[PDB]
Short mmCIF file of C-alpha atoms and ligand atoms in Angstrom, two decimals:
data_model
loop_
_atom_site.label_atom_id
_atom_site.label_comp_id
_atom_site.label_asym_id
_atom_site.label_seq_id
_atom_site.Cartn_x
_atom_site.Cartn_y
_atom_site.Cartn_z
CA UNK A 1 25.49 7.20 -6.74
CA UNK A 2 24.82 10.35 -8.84
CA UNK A 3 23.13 13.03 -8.00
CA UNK A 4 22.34 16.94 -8.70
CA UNK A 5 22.59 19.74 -7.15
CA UNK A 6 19.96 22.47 -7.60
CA UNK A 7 21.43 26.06 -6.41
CA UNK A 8 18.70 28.38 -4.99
CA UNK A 9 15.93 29.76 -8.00
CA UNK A 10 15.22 33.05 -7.20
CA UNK A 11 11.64 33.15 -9.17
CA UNK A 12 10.43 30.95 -11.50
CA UNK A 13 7.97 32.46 -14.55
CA UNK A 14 7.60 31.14 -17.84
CA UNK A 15 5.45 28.41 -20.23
CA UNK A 16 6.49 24.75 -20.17
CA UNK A 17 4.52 22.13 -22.76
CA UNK A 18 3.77 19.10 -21.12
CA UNK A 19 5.21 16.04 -21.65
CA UNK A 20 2.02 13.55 -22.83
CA UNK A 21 0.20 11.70 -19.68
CA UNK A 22 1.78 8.19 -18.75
CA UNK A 23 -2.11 7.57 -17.78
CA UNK A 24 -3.41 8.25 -20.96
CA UNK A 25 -0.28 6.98 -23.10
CA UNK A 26 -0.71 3.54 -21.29
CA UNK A 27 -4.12 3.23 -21.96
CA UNK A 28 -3.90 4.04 -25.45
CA UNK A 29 -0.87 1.93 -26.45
CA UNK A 30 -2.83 -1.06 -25.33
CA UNK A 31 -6.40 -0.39 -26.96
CA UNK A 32 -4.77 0.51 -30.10
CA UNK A 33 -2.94 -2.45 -30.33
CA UNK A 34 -6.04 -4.71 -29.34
CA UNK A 35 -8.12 -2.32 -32.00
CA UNK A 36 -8.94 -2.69 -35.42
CA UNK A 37 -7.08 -0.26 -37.60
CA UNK A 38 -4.25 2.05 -37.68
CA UNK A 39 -4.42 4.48 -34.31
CA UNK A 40 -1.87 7.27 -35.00
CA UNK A 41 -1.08 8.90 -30.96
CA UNK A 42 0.33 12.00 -31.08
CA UNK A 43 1.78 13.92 -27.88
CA UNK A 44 2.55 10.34 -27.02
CA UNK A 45 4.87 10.59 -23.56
CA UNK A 46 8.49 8.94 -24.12
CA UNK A 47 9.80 8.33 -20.54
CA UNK A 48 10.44 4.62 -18.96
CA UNK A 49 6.75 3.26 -17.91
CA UNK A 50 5.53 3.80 -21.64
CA UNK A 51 8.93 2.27 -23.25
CA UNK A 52 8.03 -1.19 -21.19
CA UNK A 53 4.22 -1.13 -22.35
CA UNK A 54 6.01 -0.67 -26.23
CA UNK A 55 8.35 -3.14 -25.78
CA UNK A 56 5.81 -5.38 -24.06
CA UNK A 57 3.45 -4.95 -27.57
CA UNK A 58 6.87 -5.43 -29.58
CA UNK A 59 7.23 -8.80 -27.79
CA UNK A 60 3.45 -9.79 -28.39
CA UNK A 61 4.06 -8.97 -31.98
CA UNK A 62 2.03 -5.86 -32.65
CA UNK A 63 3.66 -4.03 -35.15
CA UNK A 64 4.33 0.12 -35.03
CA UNK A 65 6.56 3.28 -35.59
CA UNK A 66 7.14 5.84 -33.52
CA UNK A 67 8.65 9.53 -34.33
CA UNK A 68 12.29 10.11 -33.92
CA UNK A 69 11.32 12.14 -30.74
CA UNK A 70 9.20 9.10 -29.71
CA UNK A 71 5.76 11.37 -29.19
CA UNK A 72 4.30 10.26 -32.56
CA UNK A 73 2.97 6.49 -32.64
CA UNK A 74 1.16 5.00 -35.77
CA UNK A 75 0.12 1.40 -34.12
CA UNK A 76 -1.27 -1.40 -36.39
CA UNK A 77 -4.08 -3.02 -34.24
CA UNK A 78 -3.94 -6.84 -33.66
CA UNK A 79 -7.88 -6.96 -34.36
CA UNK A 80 -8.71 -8.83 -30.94
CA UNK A 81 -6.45 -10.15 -27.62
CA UNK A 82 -2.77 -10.32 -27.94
CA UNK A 83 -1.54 -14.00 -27.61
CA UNK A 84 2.11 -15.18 -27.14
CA UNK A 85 3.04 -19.19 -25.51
CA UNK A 86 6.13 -20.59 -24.25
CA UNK A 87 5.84 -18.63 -20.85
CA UNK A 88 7.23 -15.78 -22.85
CA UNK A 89 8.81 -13.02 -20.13
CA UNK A 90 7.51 -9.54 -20.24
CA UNK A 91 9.91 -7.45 -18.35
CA UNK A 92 7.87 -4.12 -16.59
CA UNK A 93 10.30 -2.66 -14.80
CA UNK A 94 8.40 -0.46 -12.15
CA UNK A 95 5.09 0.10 -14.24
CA UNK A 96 2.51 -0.25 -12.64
CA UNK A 97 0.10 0.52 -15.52
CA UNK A 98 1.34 -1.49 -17.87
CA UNK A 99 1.54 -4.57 -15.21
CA UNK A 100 -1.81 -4.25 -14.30
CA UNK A 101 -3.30 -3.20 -17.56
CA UNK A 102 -1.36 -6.55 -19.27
CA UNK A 103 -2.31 -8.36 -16.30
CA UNK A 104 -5.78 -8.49 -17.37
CA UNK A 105 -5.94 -8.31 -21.21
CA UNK A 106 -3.63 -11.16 -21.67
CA UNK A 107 -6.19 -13.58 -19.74
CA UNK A 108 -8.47 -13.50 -22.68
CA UNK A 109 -8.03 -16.86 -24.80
CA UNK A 110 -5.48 -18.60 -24.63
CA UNK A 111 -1.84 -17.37 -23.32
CA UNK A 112 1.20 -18.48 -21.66
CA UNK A 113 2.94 -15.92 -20.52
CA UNK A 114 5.09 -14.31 -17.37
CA UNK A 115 4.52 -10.64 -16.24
CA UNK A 116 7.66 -9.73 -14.18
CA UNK A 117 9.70 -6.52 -13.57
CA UNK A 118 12.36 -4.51 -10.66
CA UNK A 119 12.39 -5.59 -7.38
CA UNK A 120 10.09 -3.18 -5.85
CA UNK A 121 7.15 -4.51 -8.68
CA UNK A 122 7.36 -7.45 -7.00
CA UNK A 123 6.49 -6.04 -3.71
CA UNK A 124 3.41 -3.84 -5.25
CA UNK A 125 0.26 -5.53 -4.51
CA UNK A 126 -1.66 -7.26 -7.47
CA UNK A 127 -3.79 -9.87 -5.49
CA UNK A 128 -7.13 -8.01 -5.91
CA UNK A 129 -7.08 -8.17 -9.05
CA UNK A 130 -5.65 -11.98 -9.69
CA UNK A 131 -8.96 -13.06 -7.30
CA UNK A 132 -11.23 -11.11 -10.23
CA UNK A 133 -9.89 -12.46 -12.69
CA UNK A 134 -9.99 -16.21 -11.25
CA UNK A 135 -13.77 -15.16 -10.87
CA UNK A 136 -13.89 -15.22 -14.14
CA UNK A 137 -12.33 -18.01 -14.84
CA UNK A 138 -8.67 -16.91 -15.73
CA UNK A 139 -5.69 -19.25 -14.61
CA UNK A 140 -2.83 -17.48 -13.11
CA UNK A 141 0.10 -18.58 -11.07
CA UNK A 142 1.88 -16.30 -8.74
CA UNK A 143 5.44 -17.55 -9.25
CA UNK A 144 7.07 -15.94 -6.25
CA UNK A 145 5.05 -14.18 -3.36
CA UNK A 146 1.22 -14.69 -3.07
CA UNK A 147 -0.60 -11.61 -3.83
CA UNK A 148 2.22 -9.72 -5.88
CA UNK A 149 3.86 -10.03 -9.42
CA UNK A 150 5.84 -11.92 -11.20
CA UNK A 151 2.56 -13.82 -12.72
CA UNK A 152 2.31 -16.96 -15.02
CA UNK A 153 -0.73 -15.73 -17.29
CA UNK A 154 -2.41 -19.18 -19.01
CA UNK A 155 -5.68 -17.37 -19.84
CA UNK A 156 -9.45 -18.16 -19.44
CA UNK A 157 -11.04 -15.21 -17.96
CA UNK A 158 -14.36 -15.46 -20.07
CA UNK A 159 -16.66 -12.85 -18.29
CA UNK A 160 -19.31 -13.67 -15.55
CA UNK A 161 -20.29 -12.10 -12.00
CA UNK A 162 -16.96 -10.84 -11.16
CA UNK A 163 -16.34 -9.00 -8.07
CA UNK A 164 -13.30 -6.82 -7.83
CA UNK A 165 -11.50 -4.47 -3.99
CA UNK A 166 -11.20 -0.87 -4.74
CA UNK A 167 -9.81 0.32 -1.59
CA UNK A 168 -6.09 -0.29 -2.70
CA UNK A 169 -5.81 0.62 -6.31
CA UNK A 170 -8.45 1.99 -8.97
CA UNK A 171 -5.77 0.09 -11.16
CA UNK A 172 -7.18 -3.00 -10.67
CA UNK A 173 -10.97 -2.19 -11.65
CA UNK A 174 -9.48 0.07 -14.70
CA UNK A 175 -7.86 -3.49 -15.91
CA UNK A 176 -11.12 -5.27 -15.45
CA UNK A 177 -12.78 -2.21 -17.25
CA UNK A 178 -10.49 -2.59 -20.38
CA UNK A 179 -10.50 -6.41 -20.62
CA UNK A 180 -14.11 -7.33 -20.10
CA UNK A 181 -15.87 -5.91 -23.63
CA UNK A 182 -13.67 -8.58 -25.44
CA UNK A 183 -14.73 -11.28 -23.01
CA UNK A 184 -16.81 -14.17 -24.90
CA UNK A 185 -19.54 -13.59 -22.15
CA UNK A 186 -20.80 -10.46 -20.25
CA UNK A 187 -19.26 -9.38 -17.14
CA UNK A 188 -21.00 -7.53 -14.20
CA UNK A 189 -17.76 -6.16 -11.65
CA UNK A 190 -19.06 -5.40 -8.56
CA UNK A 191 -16.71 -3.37 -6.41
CA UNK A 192 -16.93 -5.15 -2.82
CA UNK A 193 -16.66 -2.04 -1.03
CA UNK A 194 -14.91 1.41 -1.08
CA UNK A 195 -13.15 2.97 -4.67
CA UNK A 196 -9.66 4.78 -4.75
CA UNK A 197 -8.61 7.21 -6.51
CA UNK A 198 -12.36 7.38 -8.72
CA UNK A 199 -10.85 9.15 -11.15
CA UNK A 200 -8.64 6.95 -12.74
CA UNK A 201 -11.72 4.69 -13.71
CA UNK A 202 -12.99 8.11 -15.65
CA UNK A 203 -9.77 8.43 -17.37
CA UNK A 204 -10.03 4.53 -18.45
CA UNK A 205 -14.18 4.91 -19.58
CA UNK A 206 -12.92 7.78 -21.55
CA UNK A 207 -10.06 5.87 -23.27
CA UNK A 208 -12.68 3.31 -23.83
CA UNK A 209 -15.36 5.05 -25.20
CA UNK A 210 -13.21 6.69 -27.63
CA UNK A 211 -12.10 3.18 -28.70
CA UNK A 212 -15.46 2.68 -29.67
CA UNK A 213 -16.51 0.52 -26.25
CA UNK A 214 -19.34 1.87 -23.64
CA UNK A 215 -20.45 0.02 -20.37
CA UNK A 216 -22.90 0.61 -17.86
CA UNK A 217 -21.90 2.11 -15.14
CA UNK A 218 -24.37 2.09 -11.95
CA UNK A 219 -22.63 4.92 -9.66
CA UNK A 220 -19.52 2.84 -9.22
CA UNK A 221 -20.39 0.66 -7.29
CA UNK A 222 -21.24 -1.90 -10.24
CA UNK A 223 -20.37 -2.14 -13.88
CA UNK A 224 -21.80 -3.86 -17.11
CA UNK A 225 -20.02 -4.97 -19.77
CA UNK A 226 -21.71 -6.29 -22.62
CA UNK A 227 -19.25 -8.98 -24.11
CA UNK A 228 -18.30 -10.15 -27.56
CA UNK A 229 -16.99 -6.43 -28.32
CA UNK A 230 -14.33 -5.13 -30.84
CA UNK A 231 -12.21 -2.09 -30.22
CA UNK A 232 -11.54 0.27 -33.27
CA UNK A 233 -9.10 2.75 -33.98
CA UNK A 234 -10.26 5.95 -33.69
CA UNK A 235 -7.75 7.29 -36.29
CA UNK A 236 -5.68 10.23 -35.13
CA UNK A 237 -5.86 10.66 -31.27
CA UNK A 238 -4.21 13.31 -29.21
CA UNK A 239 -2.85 12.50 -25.65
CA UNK A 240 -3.18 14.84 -23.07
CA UNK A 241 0.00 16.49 -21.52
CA UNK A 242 0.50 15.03 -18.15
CA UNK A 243 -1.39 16.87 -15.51
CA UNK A 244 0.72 14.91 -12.67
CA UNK A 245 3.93 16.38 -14.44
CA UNK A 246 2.42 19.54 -14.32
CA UNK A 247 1.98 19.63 -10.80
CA UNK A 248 5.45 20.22 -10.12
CA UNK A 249 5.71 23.61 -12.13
CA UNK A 250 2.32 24.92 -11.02
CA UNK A 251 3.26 24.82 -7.29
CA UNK A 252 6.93 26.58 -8.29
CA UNK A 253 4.96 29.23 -9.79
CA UNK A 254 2.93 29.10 -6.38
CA UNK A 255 5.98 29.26 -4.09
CA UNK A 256 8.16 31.71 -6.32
CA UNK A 257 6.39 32.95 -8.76
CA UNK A 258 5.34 34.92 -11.35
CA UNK A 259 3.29 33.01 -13.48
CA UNK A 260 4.32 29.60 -15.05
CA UNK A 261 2.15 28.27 -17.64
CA UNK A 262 1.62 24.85 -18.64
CA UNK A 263 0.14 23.75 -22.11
CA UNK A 264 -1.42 20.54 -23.37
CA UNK A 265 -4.06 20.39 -20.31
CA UNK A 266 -7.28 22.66 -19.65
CA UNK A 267 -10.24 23.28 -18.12
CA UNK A 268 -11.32 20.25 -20.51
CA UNK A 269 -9.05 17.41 -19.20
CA UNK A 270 -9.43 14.08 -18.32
CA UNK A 271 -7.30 14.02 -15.98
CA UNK A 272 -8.26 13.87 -12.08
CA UNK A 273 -5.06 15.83 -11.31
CA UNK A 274 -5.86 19.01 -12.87
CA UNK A 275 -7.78 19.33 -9.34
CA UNK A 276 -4.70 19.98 -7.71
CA UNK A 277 -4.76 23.86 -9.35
CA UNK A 278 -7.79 24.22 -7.18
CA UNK A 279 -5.58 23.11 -3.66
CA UNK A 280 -2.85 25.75 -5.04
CA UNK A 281 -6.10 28.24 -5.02
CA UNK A 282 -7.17 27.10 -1.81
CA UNK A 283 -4.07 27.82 -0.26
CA UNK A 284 -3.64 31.28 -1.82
CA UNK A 285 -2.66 31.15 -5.22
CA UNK A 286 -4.52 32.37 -8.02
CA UNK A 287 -5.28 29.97 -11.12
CA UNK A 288 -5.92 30.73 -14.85
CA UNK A 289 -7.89 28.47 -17.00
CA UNK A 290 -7.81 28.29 -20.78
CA UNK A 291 -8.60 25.49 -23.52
CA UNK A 292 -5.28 23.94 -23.95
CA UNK A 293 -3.32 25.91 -20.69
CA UNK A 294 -3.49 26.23 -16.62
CA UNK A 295 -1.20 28.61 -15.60
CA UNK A 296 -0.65 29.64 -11.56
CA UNK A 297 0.39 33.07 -10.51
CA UNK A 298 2.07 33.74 -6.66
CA UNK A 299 -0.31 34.95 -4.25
CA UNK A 300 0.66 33.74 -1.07
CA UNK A 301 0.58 30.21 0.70
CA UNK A 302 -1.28 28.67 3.33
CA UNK A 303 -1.43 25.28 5.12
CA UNK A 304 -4.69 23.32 3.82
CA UNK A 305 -5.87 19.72 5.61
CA UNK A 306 -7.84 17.91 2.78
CA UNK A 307 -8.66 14.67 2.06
CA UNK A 308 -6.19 13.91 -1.24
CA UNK A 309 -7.66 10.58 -2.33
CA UNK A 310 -8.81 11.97 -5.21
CA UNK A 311 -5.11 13.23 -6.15
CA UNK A 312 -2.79 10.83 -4.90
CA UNK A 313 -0.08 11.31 -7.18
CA UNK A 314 -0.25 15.22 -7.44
CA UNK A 315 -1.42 15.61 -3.73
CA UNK A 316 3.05 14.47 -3.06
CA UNK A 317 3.74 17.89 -4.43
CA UNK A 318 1.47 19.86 -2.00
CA UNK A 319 3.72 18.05 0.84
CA UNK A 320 7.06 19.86 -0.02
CA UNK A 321 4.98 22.81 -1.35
CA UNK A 322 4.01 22.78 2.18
CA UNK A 323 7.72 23.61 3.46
CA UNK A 324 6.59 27.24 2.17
CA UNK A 325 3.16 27.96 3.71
CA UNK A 326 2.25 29.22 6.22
CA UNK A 327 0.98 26.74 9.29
CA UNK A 328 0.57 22.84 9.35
CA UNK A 329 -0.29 21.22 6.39
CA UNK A 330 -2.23 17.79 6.35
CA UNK A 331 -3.01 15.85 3.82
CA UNK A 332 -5.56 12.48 4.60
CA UNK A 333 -7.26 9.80 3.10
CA UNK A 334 -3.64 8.78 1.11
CA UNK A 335 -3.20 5.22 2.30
CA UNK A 336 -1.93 3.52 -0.35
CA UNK A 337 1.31 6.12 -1.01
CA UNK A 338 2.39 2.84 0.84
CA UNK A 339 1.87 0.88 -2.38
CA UNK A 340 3.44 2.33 -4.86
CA UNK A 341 7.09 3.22 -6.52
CA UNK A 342 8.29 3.41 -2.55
CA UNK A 343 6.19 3.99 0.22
CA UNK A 344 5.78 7.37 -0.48
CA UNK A 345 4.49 8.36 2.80
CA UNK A 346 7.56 6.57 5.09
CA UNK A 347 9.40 8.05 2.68
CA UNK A 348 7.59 11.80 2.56
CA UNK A 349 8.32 11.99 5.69
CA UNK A 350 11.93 11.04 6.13
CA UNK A 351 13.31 13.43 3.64
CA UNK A 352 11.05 16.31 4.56
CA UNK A 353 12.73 15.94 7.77
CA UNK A 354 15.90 16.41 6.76
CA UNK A 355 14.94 19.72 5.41
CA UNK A 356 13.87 20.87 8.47
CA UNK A 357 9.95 20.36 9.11
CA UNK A 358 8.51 18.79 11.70
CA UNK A 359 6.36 15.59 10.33
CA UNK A 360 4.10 13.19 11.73
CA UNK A 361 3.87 10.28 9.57
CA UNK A 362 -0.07 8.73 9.94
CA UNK A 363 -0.91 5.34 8.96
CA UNK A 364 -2.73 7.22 6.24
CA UNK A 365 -1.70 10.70 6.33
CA UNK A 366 0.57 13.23 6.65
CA UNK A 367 1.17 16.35 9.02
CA UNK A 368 4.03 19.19 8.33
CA UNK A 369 4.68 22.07 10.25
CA UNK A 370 7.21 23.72 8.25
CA UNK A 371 10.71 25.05 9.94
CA UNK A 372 11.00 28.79 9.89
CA UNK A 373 14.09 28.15 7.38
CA UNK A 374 15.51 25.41 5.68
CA UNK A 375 18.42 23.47 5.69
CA UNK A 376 20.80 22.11 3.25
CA UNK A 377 20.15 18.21 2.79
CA UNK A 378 20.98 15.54 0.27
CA UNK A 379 17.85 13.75 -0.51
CA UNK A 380 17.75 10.03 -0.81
CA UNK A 381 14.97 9.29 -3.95
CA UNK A 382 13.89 5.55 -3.08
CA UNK A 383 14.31 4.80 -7.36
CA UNK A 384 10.73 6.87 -6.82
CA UNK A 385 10.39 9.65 -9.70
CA UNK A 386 8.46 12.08 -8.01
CA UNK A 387 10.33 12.13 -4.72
CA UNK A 388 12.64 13.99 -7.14
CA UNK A 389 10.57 16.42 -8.47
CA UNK A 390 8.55 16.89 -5.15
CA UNK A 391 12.03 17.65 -3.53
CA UNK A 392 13.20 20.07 -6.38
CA UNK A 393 11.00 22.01 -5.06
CA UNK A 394 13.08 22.57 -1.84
CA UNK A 395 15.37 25.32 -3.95
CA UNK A 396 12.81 27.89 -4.40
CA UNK A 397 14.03 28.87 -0.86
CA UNK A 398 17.99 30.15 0.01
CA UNK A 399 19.52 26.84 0.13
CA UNK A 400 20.35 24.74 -2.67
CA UNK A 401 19.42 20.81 -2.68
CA UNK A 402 21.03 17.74 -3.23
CA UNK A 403 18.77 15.35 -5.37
CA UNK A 404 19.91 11.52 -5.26
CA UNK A 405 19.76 9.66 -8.23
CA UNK A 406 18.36 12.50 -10.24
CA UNK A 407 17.35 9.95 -13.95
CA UNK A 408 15.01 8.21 -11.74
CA UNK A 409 12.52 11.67 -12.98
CA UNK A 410 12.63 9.05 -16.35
CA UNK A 411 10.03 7.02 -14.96
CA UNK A 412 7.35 9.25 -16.21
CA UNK A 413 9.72 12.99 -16.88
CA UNK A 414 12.67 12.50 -18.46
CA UNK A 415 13.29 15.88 -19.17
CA UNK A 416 12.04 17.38 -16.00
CA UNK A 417 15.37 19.18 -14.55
CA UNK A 418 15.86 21.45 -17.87
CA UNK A 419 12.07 22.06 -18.22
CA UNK A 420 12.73 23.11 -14.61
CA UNK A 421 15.57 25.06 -15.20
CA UNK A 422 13.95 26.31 -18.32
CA UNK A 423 11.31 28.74 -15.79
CA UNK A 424 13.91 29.13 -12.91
CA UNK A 425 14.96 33.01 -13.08
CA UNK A 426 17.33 34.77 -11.52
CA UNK A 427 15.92 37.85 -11.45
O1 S3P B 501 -4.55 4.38 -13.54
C1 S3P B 501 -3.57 5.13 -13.56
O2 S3P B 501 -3.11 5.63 -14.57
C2 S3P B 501 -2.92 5.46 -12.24
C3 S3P B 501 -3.70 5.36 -11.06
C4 S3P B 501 -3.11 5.65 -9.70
O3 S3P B 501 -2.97 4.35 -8.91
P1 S3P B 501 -3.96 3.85 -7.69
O4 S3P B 501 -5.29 3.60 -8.29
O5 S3P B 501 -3.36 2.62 -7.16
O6 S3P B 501 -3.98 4.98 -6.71
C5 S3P B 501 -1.81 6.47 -9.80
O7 S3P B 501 -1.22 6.55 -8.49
C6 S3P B 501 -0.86 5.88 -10.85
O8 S3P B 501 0.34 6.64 -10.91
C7 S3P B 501 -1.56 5.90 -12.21
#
């Protein structure tokens, strides 16, 4: 087992440029390599879920380059759906976006082919999303456990009434939303009840749009999708720096700060978790907005209780941010932590015990009373990259931190412990 150990930062202050968003890098791998044209992605993110989407399109046979510090991408669209036969294996690992995304596209035509990936993909759910795409008349096998991947993709899904669950994962819809313009027919998705994490689906209609695709979209509750579409490149595209990356650096500048800047995101983002600067202001921090920056300056902390659906990924950082304020914390409405690289809230809770807080693990929520000090612990990182960088946190106190199997940051950060260390002063 390896592991780090992060001695006690003593303020943190400085500028860090963002890696690129795994959100947006996902999402633009795969339309440029259904488009027409040469897309050329710059600020591209290089970290583990975006190397499985490439070497997914390598294995499809789309054809592209990439920089020698993997952020530049010039991608030769396929001109229409990626086909490959022969039950041909794409291997995932733990990404969700590029399992769901491929999950859908490849039902278009014809296809014979086997999503799969690490143990824990197989125990993320997928079923909501296999039952829309059956309503539209794709063919897919679940090869092991009902409901969850590893699927045998053998294509079909031609467009129709389609209805589609959004109370687990936005993922599902945004994979519906990407697949249905190159559908033969139209589509109408109807979402049977209540949306997560909404804005996810604006991140994919953005991607879309600037693809050269628009839909209908009746206050999300139904979309239309005119069929019979082409995506085109739209030449030169920038990606966003990753907003859910930035979290982590905002909240140290919260905690111990000084004033840490991070570039490649504005007030102008995309992004849903840019929101979480205004819970850092809510709590007592001060925020600074600019075109292509956000930067945070210390002001002081207090517990918030707020309904995080809206920031699920981000809204993990506010719970070991919440070791420093002052009162309980709660965050609500965050069900499906339980679904994703771990169950992030069995496993919130757990470590932030060992720290020292008081927790009360909710079905769908979490409580923290923070201890008036905390204590050394080694924390265990369920092969989940942000129950690394959420715990990293834990050393802008007096005791250092033990992180488990520190490379699992790779998933979407590779390079998150130096571009930690990088603000961490010790003066
Ligand atoms: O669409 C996306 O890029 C993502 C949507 C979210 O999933 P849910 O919709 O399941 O919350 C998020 O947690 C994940 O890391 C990325």
């Amino acid at each position: 087992m390896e592991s780090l150990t992060l001695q006690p930062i003593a303020r943190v202050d400085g500028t860090i440029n963002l890696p690129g968003s795994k959100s947006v890098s996902n999402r633009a791998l795969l339309l440029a390599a259904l488009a027409h044209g040469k897309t050329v992605l710059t600020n591209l993110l290089d970290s583990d879920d975006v190397r499985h989407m490439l070497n997914a399109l390598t294995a499809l046979g789309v054809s592209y380059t990439l920089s020698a510090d993997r952020t530049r991408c010039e991608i030769i669209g396929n001109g229409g759906p990626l086909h490959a036969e022969g039950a041909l294996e794409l291997f995932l690992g733990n990404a969700g976006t590029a399992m769901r995304l491929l999950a859908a596209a490849l039902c278009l035509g014809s296809n014979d082919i086997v999503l799969t990936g690490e143990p824990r993909m197989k125990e993320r759910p997928i079923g909501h999303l296999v039952d829309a795409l059956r309503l539209g008349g794709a063919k897919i096998t679940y090869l092991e456990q009902e409901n969850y991947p590893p699927l045998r993709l053998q294509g079909g899904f031609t467009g129709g009434n389609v209805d589609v669950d959004g109370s687990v994962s936005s993922q599902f819809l945004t994979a519906l939303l990407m697949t249905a313009p190159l559908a033969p027919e139209d589509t109408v998705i109807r979402i049977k009840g209540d949306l997560v994490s909404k804005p996810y689906i604006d991140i994919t209609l953005n991607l879309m749009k600037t693809f050269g695709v628009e839909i209908e979209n009746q206050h999300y509750q139904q979309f239309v999708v005119k069929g019979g579409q082409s995506y085109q490149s739209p030449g030169t595209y920038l990606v966003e720096g990753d907003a859910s990356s930035a979290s982590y650096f905002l909240a140290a500048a919260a905690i111990k700060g000084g004033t840490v800047k991070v570039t490649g995101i504005g007030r102008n983002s995309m992004q849903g978790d840019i929101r979480f600067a205004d819970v850092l202001e809510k709590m007592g921090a001060t925020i600074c907005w600019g075109d292509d920056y956000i930067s945070c300056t210390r002001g002081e902390l207090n517990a918030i209780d707020m309904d995080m659906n809206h920031i699920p990924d981000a809204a993990m950082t506010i719970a070991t941010a919440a070791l420093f304020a002052k009162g309980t914390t709660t965050l609500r409405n965050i069900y499906n932590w339980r679904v994703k690289e771990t169950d992030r809230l069995f496993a919130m809770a757990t470590e932030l015990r060992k720290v020292g807080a008081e927790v009360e693990e909710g079905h769908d929520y979490i409580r923290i009373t923070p201890p008036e000090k905390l204590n050394f612990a080694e924390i265990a990182t369920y092969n989940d990259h942000r129950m690394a960088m959420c715990f990293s946190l834990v050393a802008l106190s007096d005791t250092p931190v033990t992180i488990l199997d520190p490379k699992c940051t790779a998933k979407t950060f590779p390079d998150y412990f130096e571009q930690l260390a990088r603000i961490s002063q010790a003066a």
